Amino acid sequence: DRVNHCLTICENIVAQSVRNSPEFQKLLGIAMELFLLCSDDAESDVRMVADECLNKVIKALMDSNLPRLQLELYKEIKKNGAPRSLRAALWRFAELAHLVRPQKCRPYLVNLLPCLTRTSKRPEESVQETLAAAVPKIMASFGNFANDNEIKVLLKAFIANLKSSSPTIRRTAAGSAVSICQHSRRTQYFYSWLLNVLLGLLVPVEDEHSTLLILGVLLTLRYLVPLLQ
Amino acid sequence: TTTCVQLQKQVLDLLAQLVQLRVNYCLLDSDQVFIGFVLKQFEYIEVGQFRESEAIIPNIFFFLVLLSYEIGIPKIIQLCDGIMASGRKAVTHAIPALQPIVHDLFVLGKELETQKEVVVSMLLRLIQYHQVLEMFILVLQQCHKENEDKWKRLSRQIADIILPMLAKQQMHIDSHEALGVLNTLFEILAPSSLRPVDMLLRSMFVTPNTMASVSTVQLWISGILAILRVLISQSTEDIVLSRIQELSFSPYLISCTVINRLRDGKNLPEETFSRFLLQLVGILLEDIVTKQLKVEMSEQQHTFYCQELGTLLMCLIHIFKSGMFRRITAAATRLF
């Protein structure tokens, strides 16, 4: 009954042919909250049905109503709750980060930096491993719009996860920090800043350095060498 | 509503066609929302907050001038000046903006003359790139068709701008297309602008700052080649050698110890010109042989450096075979 409920919600959203209406926007917001509630329940049926269903709803509506969507989409990032809900959410929204306009990109950056600081500290391995393909897409679409101090704070936030013991969180922090510095604003200055920080982490080498940290620093340098050319 | 840029490019080309084919401007029946949105895109480009502005800007300016033939031309020149005087590098934003402006203002009363002077001064501010030199070849041809006195004065003015830039290696001549455009620029330029051989020789016999870098050598030898083709073509033999007789041009300008300290850190004009040529050959061959392939130079720099040596040996062959240069051949037979 819940599967057919989410599916009839889909077939009643799409078959309106009524766009830019306040009733349709309110119905779409309530039903979008219902979709990311449909994607939470623990079974392989309801999650996958709501997943393909929500992809149909998003791809059917990229033309007309884009900013109402990503308004509701960032509203259900900011809640910062379940792993699977935020995971599928951040999938879709990193994929749709490049459909924004450069008129509205600065508020989405100002509001996406605290949520990236929040979800950069989550100890779940799957949330990190799906944050691997999000900071490149968001910081390629939005990255040229921040100032210096915000990118310094957000780089220190991703550097503070190089100390962990899981391999996935270290490689996602590495790829995240490097892909922040790929598209930032002044690429060579941030490359020199990460070289200063990473060589400061291993200053004189005849010391104890918590070898997981050494692995993380070498993985950051493996991602950072190919762009110093 | 979009963000993909090739859609925006095709929409601007479709509107350029709809304004070329003489329909009314009834696509915006009441208001002017589209063109104000285009001006807002100019604001977002000039700030720098745009992702793929490289592939959109000439179609925007072509649409603006093709609309303004019915927006003033001064507003289009002020937008191009706003991109130029405050923005990114100029091979993608400023010069593809200058192409549809200059091509659709010279080829196709007093206000036109003032805008011509402003656009010419803008091109004089951006001489350093060879695409501006192609655009200025179009300038010189469209001035030579109209009147010759303006042609001679404007050629004189850009000639004594362009020769100190060749003297101080400030001209980007790293490509073969840059030498091609530079040589066709000096061919199409007026003969009375280059007729005293003072400035063509004071910019010829020059020494670079440090020839330890590959690009400095490459720009210096490109300047020497691109002025030496003019000295072979435009001027005779006795005039050049007498002009070297009057000016104190020593043949020990680039001697062996001068080249070595730059890499580490009674005379006939026959003698000076011949030793200068053969020692430029020495620099090119000793640099092609004993330099590494990916350590010191790139792959395109290697082909253009080999290609410079090819064109300089061709210039030596044309000096030795044409029969117009007799004294230089006698000097080379007594200097080899």
SS3 string, chain A, reads CHHHHHHHHHHHHHCCCCCCCHHHHHHHHHHHHHHHHHCCCCCHHHHHHHHHHHHHHHHHCCCCCCHHHHHHHHHHHHCCCCHHHHHHHHHHHHHCHHHCCCCCHHHHHHHHHHHHHHHCCCCCHHHHHHHCCCHHHHHHHCHHHCCHHHHHHHHHHHHCCCCCCCHHHHHHHHHHHHHHHHCCCCHHHHHHHHHHHHHHHCCCCCCCCCCHHHHHHHHHHHHHHHHCC
Nearest to B106 by CA among B74, B135, B68: B135
Residues of chain B in contact with residue A105, where contact means CB-CB under 8 angstroms, are: 49
Q: Is B39 helix (H, G, I), strand (E, B) or coil?
A: helix
Residues of chain B in contact with residue A102, where contact means CB-CB under 8 angstroms, are: 44, 49-51
Nearest to A176 by CA among A216, A149, A212, A215: A216
DSSP calls for B230-259:
HHHHTS-HHHHHHHHHHTT--TTTT-HHHH
Cα of A100 to nearest chain B Cα, Å:
7
What chain B residue is nearest to A141 in terms of C-alpha separation? B51
Start-end of H helices in B147-267: 148-167, 176-188, 198-202, 214-233, 237-246, 256-264
Q: How far apart are CA B216 and CA B213, in angstroms?
A: 6
Cα of B295 to nearest chain A Cα, Å:
13
Check A102 against B51: CB less than 8 A apart: yes
Cα of B274 to nearest chain A Cα, Å:
42
Residues of chain B in contact with residue A70, where contact means CB-CB under 8 angstroms, are: none
Q: How far apart are CA B327 and CA B315, in angstroms?
A: 16
| CB of A77 closer than 8 Å to CB of A117 | no
| CB of A154 closer than 8 Å to CB of A180 | yes
| CB of B151 closer than 8 Å to CB of B143 | yes
Q: How far apart are CA B231 and CA B256, in angstroms?
A: 25
Cα of B39 to nearest chain A Cα, Å:
13
Q: How far apart are CA A49 and CA A123, in angstroms?
A: 28
Give first-to-last CA distance, chain B, whole Å: 72
Q: How far apart are CA B251 and CA B256, in angstroms?
A: 11
Q: Indicate the length of chain B as a whole number.
A: 336
What residue type is assigned to position B330 of the chain?
A
Nearest to A144 among B1, B3, B49 (CB): B49
Q: How far apart are CA A110 and CA B87, in angstroms?
A: 24
Check B40 against A103: CB less than 8 A apart: yes
Q: How far apart are CA B164 and CA B227, in angstroms?
A: 12
Torsion of CA B267, B270, B275, B278, to 10 degrees: -170
| Token pair of B240 as six digits | 């050049």
Q: Rg of chain B's alpha carbons, rounded to an integer?
A: 24
Residues of chain A in contact with residue B44, where contact means CB-CB under 8 angstroms, are: 102-103
Local structure of residue B294 (DSSP, 8 states): T
Which of B51, B56, B294 is most worth mutating to test chain A (most A CB atoms within 10 A of its CB)? B51
| CB of B197 closer than 8 Å to CB of B233 | no
Residue with structure tokens 């290696």? B169
Residues of chain A in contact with residue B53, where contact means CB-CB under 8 angstroms, are: none
Check A98 against B40: CB less than 8 A apart: no
Nearest to B3 among A100, A144, A145 (CB): A100
Nearest to B3 among A98, A144, A145 (CB): A98
Nearest to B185 by CA among B239, B129, B146, B235: B129
Write phi, then psi, for B156 (nearest 5 degrees): -65, -40
Q: Indicate the length of chain A as a whole number.
A: 229
| Token pair of A201 as six digits | 């982490």
Nearest to A160 by CA among A176, A148, A144, A146: A176
Residues of chain B in contact with residue A101, where contact means CB-CB under 8 angstroms, are: 1, 3
Q: Is B1 helix (H, G, I), strand (E, B) or coil?
A: coil
Check B3 against A101: CB less than 8 A apart: yes
| CB of B270 closer than 8 Å to CB of B327 | yes
Residues of chain B in contact with residue A98, where contact means CB-CB under 8 angstroms, are: 3
Nearest to A97 by CA among A147, A60, A140: A140
| Token pair of A73 as six digits | 């989409």
CA B244 to chain centre: 27
Q: How far apart are CA B153 and CA B325, in angstroms?
A: 31
| CB of B83 closer than 8 Å to CB of B94 | yes
Residues of chain A in contact with residue B49, where contact means CB-CB under 8 angstroms, are: 102, 105, 144-145
Local structure of residue B53 (DSSP, 8 states): G
Check B49 against A98: CB less than 8 A apart: no
Residues of chain B in contact with residue A63, where contact means CB-CB under 8 angstroms, are: 1
| CB of A55 closer than 8 Å to CB of A100 | no
Method used to determine the 3D structure: cryo-EM
| Token pair of B256 as six digits | 């062996």
Nearest to B206 by CA among B216, B214, B191: B216
| CB of B157 closer than 8 Å to CB of B192 | no
DSSP calls for B113-135:
HHHHHHHHHHHHHTTTSHHHHHH
Q: How far apart are CA A122 and CA A116, in angstroms?
A: 10
| CB of A131 closer than 8 Å to CB of A172 | yes
Check B3 against A144: CB less than 8 A apart: no
Nearest to B335 by CA among B277, B260, B287: B277
Q: Is B176 helix (H, G, I), strand (E, B) or coil?
A: helix
Distances in Å between the Cα of A81 and the Cα atoms of A86, A88, A118, A133, B307 are 7, 12, 11, 20, 65
A80: number of Cβ within 10 Å? 13
Check A102 against B50: CB less than 8 A apart: yes
Distances in Å between the Cα of A98 and the Cα atoms of A58, A62, B5, B232, B330 are 14, 12, 12, 57, 70
| Token pair of B139 as six digits | 């300038």
Check B49 against A105: CB less than 8 A apart: yes
What chain A residue is nearest to B53 in terms of C-alpha separation? A102
Q: How far apart are CA A100 and CA A78, in angstroms?
A: 19
Dihedral sign computed on CA atoms, order B288, B289, B291, B295? positive
Local structure of residue B60 (DSSP, 8 states): H
Q: How far apart are CA A194 and CA A182, in angstroms?
A: 12
Interface of A with B (CB under 8 A): 63, 66, 98-103, 105, 141, 144-145
Q: How far apart are CA B250 and CA B272, in angstroms?
A: 6
Distances in Å between the Cα of B148 and the Cα atoms of A108, A142, B136, B190, B213 are 59, 54, 16, 9, 43
Q: How far apart are CA A147 and CA A115, in angstroms?
A: 17
In angstroms, this model's resolution equals: 3.6
| Token pair of B231 as six digits | 């000295």
CA A167 to chain centre: 19
What chain B residue is nearest to A140 in terms of C-alpha separation? B51
Q: How far apart are CA A179 and CA A141, in angstroms?
A: 12
Check A99 against B48: CB less than 8 A apart: no
Cα of B198 to nearest chain A Cα, Å:
43
| CB of A134 closer than 8 Å to CB of A94 | yes
Question: CB within 8 A of B160, min separation 6: which ones?
Answer: B199
Residues of chain A in contact with residue B87, where contact means CB-CB under 8 angstroms, are: none
| CB of A166 closer than 8 Å to CB of A192 | no
Local structure of residue B106 (DSSP, 8 states): T
Distances in Å between the Cα of A137 and the Cα atoms of A153, A222, B31 are 19, 20, 37
Q: How far apart are CA B199 and CA B223, in angstroms?
A: 13
Question: CB within 8 A of B194, min separation 6: which ones?
Answer: B159, B186, B200, B230, B234
